[PDB]
């Protein structure tokens, strides 16, 4: 649905453009997971992988019909990072910031 897609793209651009105090695009490490060949141990821990590459492919193929489906995928992205990575690590901290940014976008979409 083009209207939903455009809303999604506007909300995700907020997250994808955000920089931390150090000038780093916090979302960059969540774009593309290491592959199953590169990092098999990730997949033994994480049963449902999610990244922004997968989210984009779903936008392009009509797999989002309602905003709650994207909310599920963003919660998956965040929760996987916090399952896999140690608390206080840069990647964990970045995931926490993504979670907060997403909830602001989702809460304002309503």
């Amino acid at each position: 649905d083009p209207e939903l897609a455009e809303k999604i793209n506007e909300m995700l651009d907020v997250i994808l453009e955000y920089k931390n105090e150090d000038g780093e695009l916090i979302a960059d490490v969540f774009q593309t997971l290491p592959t199953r060949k590169e990092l098999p141990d990730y997949y033994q821990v994480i049963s449902k992988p999610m990244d922004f590459d997968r989210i984009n492919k779903k936008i392009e193929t009509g797999r989002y019909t309602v905003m709650e489906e994207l909310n599920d995928d963003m919660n998956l992205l965040v929760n996987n990072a916090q399952t896999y990575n140690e608390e206080g690590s840069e990647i964990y901290v970045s995931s926490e910031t993504i979670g907060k940014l997403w909830k602001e976008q989702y809460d304002k979409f309503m």
Binding site: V29, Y84, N85
Partner: peptide
């Protein structure tokens, strides 16, 4: 930049 447990 992963930090596995």
């Amino acid at each position: 930049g992963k930090a596995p447990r």
